[PDB]
Design a protein around this ligand. Structure first.
Ligand SMILES: [Zn+2]
Ligand SMILES: [Zn+2]
Ligand SMILES: [Zn+2]
Ligand SMILES: [Zn+2]
Lengths: 48, 116, 45, 67, 1114
């Protein structure tokens, strides 16, 4: 549909990507060590 | 850490009724409710190899690993203090072992290193 | 006192702290605490 | 372990009879059923208390800590 | 004592169990690995070499485990009861003997340490081998423990006996929708994992394989093996005068389509379309790549030159693919027990060890040449120094693969997980039945209840009454009492022996004659094409019964096809049965009397030929008799003892054949949860959680099973005095009511103990942990938390604990990750506390406390608590025959009834179960009990027999009571008699697990999750339970619209979000941050679980554009 700001088809492939907050990807500390078991959400984003 | 009414510095987590709230003993106002439980590279490479070499003879001389872990920091500071350059790599780390062997006060001698 | 006793040597050792973990008169390495002198209260039911 | 002091059912005391019931078996080799009838135990609710007590204190004492 | 062979055949079954016990499946396989299989691995990995310095070699001559060759003593070993108290591995070292080229001269050195392999107890290599209750009393170990399990690093686990299909054999199969397939897997011991499929596409036969790119019609691959004349084929496949020639006739014309017609052209058609494996040389001849294509396939047989036998092995395979297409009755299941190869641990850890050893002798080889690429370090260099660094990979690879029950294989590339399980010390028999249990492979046929069911070809093979329910319903099963597994010996002498017995050869016989006669199939392979097998097979038994050949052979011989079958593959089920020649057996009771003299054991019977082992495949042909009163002049193989079809966990039920069959399957899962006594050293061992019973009682109506396992030497549970009747209405559906007196007398008072441990950890900055304690206040050391903390900081043995009340103090340095500063400046006060606090709603005691050290010099602390309790109402009991029971109410002794003698019943149960549950076993046990009580004599309630009824009522009436025991009694509450008669007597009742004292849980408002802010699942995680979706729909079925809102976000997940109006998305505390004016802001609230919902979909390109209205002004 027209008349809307995001109504171009240009925004239907990734040119920019937003980063979600860290509440969605919490840095959980498993307490097997003094290092935190960082989740797979960040390290996939880190390779990006 | 500071209450809003008595401004106390002592907080006591009550687990008597499995609520795990935080409260001071002075006035009795809760602090928090509903607890939220937690459910160079060339310098890196030259210690990655040195980590293998510390682990090698410790397996040979039956060294328990709280020395080999402790001995790496003794190697780490002398790495910064330019003690490694020129000298032989095999020679310097075996001297670094006996430091922690002496500090831990073990039965391990010094010629057991040099005979191997 | 009536301090720490061995497993099978059964020898009262008041071994001073952060010094050793073994026993005398044997090479054994598992240690038993002896029971206190203090009275304890119980019921009879 | 050891014999209970009383009967679980009625409550009469059986702690003076375990050695006595064993006494009537080593010497004077006797039928076990008529052994405790001589001893004075008529009720069958108490016959189970001594017939079927496994006395495993004898196997437990050999693992003493005192050599 | 007039002995006879009519009812004294039972007495030779203890002569089996005495010389040959119940841990055959674990001890003998582990022993045969240690004794024999260690040499057969190292010989196939010999002569490590190097390319640099080519004249250097190392070879080992032999290996040994345990003692040296210089001392030649037995050993010096840690005790396992000591080893389990230090969380260490109970293992034994391996010594190897090597020779190599040191330099100018070669040198041979002995007794080289390469690792320490674990050994299971009661093996011949452990110190517990054949003790005399005094050495083992010195080693404080219970002699009634069977053993058979590892004590790696503390915990005690056991290998479960796994199984799969019968490998290296073919199976028939039919499917309607996708055609019918013929699976045939083969796994030779060197890297080979190959399975072949014979498919039927629209009436055309092919062979697909996962090393060939396509399928090939069989008319090519028979000419490739030599057989080309194309009249031989239908003569081999079909025969003569049938409809098989009509069905097979499609496949003949396709050789005319390809125009091959000869043996030479038949090969390279395969090698054109072969999936070519990269050999990195690629010599490929276009003549030999097809010659090896007829070698790496169907790995049962490999041929040097002729390819003749391998051709007929395909013809045997493609014969039954048409018989299944002729009619679907000829197909078979993969659920028949003869198509299963059960396999033990000792030859299975042989696969695990050879993976590590081949991984050992190449990592050490990688070290050698790294030294040998030096000019100076090639003359005086010795390689025995570099051993010990590589030796660690074995032992850590051992203990990790046993603790974590997952195995990373390389030559097979397969990940069987969950193979190890911690054994349960809940009951004495709970550890017995876990030694004897079977775990399947779950081949993803979850839709079909075929393998879920029980097969009729299991009578005497393994137990049928013990099978769990729930998630594991029919894939776990249990061993019977008389059972042996076979083992392989050799196929070389038996194929020479059949030629002497007068069978032909495959390379001499005419192809017309093989379908006329039968065929000897050696592990499924035809070699001789026997005629008239009845003379042939019976002369073989006389070689086996006298014992010229091994006894683990099966002479299964079917008649649906023209074939006989020979099996010596080993690892298949069997049991022994006595031979009956004719209308008289071979009983010979004078030899059965000579058994009880003590010189004629179970072993000499099969040595003479009075007994032999039979598998299920020999039970096809045989005609086992029930009894000696059932002998026919055509009747063989008398059944030795009828109640041997139940294991020791199924054996303890008295009179099972009177009880209903589902009521026997219920107790075997629950008898493992009955509490009682465990071991003789149970007051010495320190294990994680122990239920102990104060006063057990050996049951009255015994069994032949329990005296063969000495279960009566340590019972679990006791006998009540049961009056089955309705009373006070508190027992309606299988509840129970007992008397308040007898619990004060001490009926059922259990004991609960629980281990906990800590480890004092050493840090890299050389900082330990301290146990300083008892900070003082107002002239007294102890705080309300510190009355039981002791002078040393370790909590004092001798007194109770209550909630709160730190019993182990612990302080940890705060520089736990800081670098060690090489000085002494500021280390005087860094210890923050991490004390250990007693939880639990009930005050308990300690039992006792120990301290020790680990395998490495690191301090170990182990304390174990102690509390007893009385079974108040709600607690779960049972009946040994499958009647669960919860305590309804606990009333006084004056409230209970009483007989003429005043005998108060211990419990009462309702009469409303016995007609529904059809449980006759309690009804006989009370009769077999009470008369045996008044006679004083303990009675035998066994399966398929036991103590009879008419002789028991005569004793019961001579004492003067009811002949059926249904007595009359008075009333407790009003005094007079009751209008009915009361069936009264003593019944053995066990106490289960699952008591109410550790199942009362309630959470009001406590901890929440981090990602959801929901109440945390887990009773130890302080609970908050899931009101699920199936319960959610029922609320709308009431139409209630507010507690549905309240119990789904108000009681659980309330969260307040401010949202913008136009371009409506959320903002934070007071901002819009998408049209940054922060004015059009609406205060409202949502679920927090809804708040994260449209935040995660915002992470990818989705805009949840929100639109608002007011509630009011409709
Ligand atoms: Zn405050
Ligand atoms: Zn000692
Ligand atoms: Zn009584
Ligand atoms: Zn907006």
């Amino acid at each position: 549909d027209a008349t809307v700001p995001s109504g171009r088809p240009e925004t239907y492939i990734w040119r920019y990507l937003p980063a979600p907050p860290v509440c969605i990807r919490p840095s959980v500390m498993m307490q097997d060590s003094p290092a935190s078991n960082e989740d797979d959400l960040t390290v996939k984003l880190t390779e990006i | 850490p500071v209450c809003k009414n008595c401004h106390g510095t002592e907080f006591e987590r009550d687990l008597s009724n499995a609520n795990n709230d935080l409260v001071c003993k002075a006035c009795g106002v809760v602090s928090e409710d509903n607890p939220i439980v937690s459910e160079l590279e060339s310098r890196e490479a030259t210690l990655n190899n040195a980590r293998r070499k510390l682990r090698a003879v410790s397996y040979a001389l039956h060294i328990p690993e709280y020395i080999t872990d402790a001995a790496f920091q003794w190697y780490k500071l002398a790495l910064a203090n330019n003690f490694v350059q020129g000298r032989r790599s095999q020679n310097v780390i075996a001297s670094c072992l006996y430091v922690a062997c002496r500090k831990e006060k073990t039965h391990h001698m010094l010629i057991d290193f040099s005979s191997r | 006192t009536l301090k720490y006793i061995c497993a099978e040597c059964s020898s009262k050792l008041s071994l001073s702290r952060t010094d050793a973990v073994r026993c005398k008169d044997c090479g054994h390495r598992i240690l038993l605490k002896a029971r206190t002198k203090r009275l304890v209260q119980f019921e009879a039911r | 372990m050891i014999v209970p002091v009383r009967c679980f059912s009625c409550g009469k005391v059986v702690g003076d009879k375990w050695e006595s019931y064993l006494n009537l078996l080593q010497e004077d080799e006797l039928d076990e059923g008529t052994a405790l009838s001589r001893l004075g135990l008529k009720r069958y609710c108490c016959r189970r208390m001594i017939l079927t007590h496994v006395d495993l204190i004898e196997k437990f004492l050999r693992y003493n800590p005192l050599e | 004592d007039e002995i006879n062979t009519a009812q004294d055949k039972w007495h030779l079954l203890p002569a089996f169990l005495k010389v040959k016990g119940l841990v055959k499946q674990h001890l003998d396989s582990f022993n045969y690995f240690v004794d024999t299989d260690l040499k057969k691995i190292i010989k196939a990995n010999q002569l490590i070499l190097s390319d640099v310095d080519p004249e250097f070699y190392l070879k080992y001559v032999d290996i040994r485990v345990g003692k040296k060759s210089s001392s030649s003593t037995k050993d010096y070993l840690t005790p396992p009861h000591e080893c389990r108290l230090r969380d260490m591995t109970y293992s034994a070292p391996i010594y190897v003997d090597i020779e190599y080229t040191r330099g100018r001269n070669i040198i041979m050195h002995k007794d080289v340490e390469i690792g320490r392999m674990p050994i299971m107890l009661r093996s011949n290599k452990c110190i517990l081998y054949d003790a005399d209750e005094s050495k083992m009393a010195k080693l404080n170990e219970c002699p009634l423990d069977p053993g058979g399990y590892f004590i790696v690093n503390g915990t005690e686990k056991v290998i479960l006996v796994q199984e799969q299909l019968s490998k290296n054999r073919i199976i028939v199969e039919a499917d309607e929708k996708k055609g019918i397939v013929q699976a045939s897997v083969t796994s030779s011991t060197h890297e080979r994992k190959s399975k072949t499929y014979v498919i039927t596409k629209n009436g055309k036969i092919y062979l697909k394989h996962n090393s060939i790119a396509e399928e090939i019609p069989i008319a090519i691959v028979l000419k490739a093996c030599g057989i080309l004349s194309d009249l031989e084929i239908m003569q081999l496949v079909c025969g003569n005068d049938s409809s098989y020639q009509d069905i097979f006739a499609v496949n003949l014309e396709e050789s005319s389509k390809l125009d091959i017609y000869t043996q030479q052209q038949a090969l390279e058609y395969i090698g054109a379309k072969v999936k070519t494996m990269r050999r990195q040389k690629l010599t490929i001849l276009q003549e030999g790549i097809e010659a090896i294509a007829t070698t790496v396939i169907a790995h049962l047989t490999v041929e040097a030159l002729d390819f003749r036998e391998k051709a007929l092995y395909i013809a045997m395979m493609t014969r039954r693919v048409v018989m299944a297409m002729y009619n679907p009755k000829m197909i078979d299941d993969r659920d028949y027990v003869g198509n299963k190869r059960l396999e033990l641990a000792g030859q299975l850890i042989s696969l695990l060890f050879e993976d590590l050893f081949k991984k050992f002798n190449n990592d050490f080889k990688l070290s050698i040449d790294k030294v040998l690429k030096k000019p100076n370090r090639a003359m005086e260099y010795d390689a025995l120094l570099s051993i010990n660094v590589h030796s660690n990979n074995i032992t850590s690879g051992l203990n990790r693969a046993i603790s974590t029950g997952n195995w990373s294989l390389k030559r097979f590339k397969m990940e069987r997980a969950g193979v190890t399980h911690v054994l349960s010390r809940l009951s004495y028999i709970s550890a017995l039945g876990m030694m004897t249990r079977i775990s399947s492979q779950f081949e993803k046929s979850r839709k079909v209840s075929g393998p879920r069911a029980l097969q009729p070809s299991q009578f005497g093979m393994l137990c049928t009454a013990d099978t769990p329910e729930g998630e594991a319903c029919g894939l776990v099963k249990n061993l019977a009492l008389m059972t042996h597994i076979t083992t392989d010996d050799e196929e070389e002498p038996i194929k020479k022996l059949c030629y002497v017995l007068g069978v032909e050869d495959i390379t001499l016989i005419d192809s017309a004659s093989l379908h006329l006669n039968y065929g000897v199939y050696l592990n499924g392979t035809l070699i001789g094409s026997i005629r008239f097998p009845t003379k042939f097979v019976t002369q073989f038994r006389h070689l086996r019964r006298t014992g010229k050949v091994s006894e683990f052979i099966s002479i299964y011989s079917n008649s649906h096809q023209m074939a006989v079958h020979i099996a010596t593959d080993g690892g298949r089920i069997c049991r022994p049965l006595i031979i009956v020649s004719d209308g008289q057996s071979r009983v010979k009771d004078i030899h059965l009397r000579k058994l009880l003299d003590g010189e004629l054991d179970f072993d000499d019977f099969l040595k003479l030929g009075l007994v032999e082992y039979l598998d299920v495949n020999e039970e096809n042909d045989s005609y086992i008799a029930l009894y000696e009163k059932d002998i026919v002049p055509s009747m063989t193989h008398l059944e030795i003892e009828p109640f041997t079809i139940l294991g020791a966990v199924a054996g303890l039920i008295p009179y099972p054949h009177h009880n209903q069959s589902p009521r026997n399957t219920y107790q075997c899962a629950m008898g493992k949860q009955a509490i009682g006594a465990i071991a003789y050293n149970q007051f010495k061992r320190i294990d994680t959680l122990l239920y102990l019973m104060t006063y057990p009682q050996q049951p009255m109506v015994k069994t032949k099973t329990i005296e063969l396992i000495d279960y009566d030497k340590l019972p679990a549970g006791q006998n009540a005095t049961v009056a089955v009747m309705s009373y006070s209405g508190y027992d309606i559906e299988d509840a129970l009511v007992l008397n308040k007196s007898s619990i004060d007398r001490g009926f059922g008072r259990c004991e609960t103990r629980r281990k906990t441990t800590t480890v004092l950890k050493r840090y890299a900055n050389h900082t330990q942990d301290i146990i300083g304690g008892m900070r003082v206040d107002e002239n007294g050391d102890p705080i309300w938390q510190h009355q039981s903390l002791g002078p040393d900081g370790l909590g004092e043995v001798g007194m109770k604990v209550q909630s709160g009340q730190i019993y182990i103090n612990k302080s940890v340095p705060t520089n736990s990750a800081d670098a060690p500063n090489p000085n002494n400046v500021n280390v005087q006060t860094q210890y923050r506390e991490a004390p250990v606090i007693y939880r639990g709603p009930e005050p308990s005691h300690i039992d006792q406390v120990m301290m020790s050290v680990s395998d490495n010099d690191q301090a170990l602390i182990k304390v174990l608590l102690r509390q007893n309790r009385r079974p108040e109402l709600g607690d779960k009991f049972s009946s040994r025959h499958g009647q669960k029971g919860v305590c309804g109410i606990i009333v006084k002794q004056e409230d209970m009834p009483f007989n003429d003698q005043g005998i108060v019943p211990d419990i009462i149960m309702n009469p409303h179960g016995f007609p529904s549950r059809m449980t006759v076993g309690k009804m006989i046990e009370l009769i077999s009990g009470k008369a045996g009580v008044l006679n004083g004599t303990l009675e035998y309630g066994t399966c398929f027999g036991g103590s009879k009824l008419e002789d028991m009522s005569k004793i019961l009436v001579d004492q003067g009571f009811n002949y059926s025991g249904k007595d009359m009694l008075y009333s407790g509450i009003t005094g007079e008699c009751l209008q009915a008669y009361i069936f009264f007597g003593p019944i053995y009742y066990q106490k289960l697990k699952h008591m109410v004292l550790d199942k009362m849980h309630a959470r009001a408002r406590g901890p929440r999750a981090v990602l959801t802010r929901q109440p945390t699942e887990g009773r130890s995680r302080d609970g908050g339970l899931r009101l699920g979706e199936m319960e959610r729909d029922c609320v709308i079925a009431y139409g209630a619209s507010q507690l549905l809102l309240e119990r789904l976000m108000i009681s659980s997940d309330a969260f307040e979000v401010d949202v913008c109006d136009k371009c409506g998305l959320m903002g934070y505390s007071g901002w819009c941050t998408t049209c940054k004016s922060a004015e059009n802001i609406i205060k409202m609230t949502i679920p927090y679980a809804a708040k994260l919902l449209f935040q995660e979909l915002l992470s990818m390109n989705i805009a949840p554009r929100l639109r608002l209205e007011d509630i009011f002004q409709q």
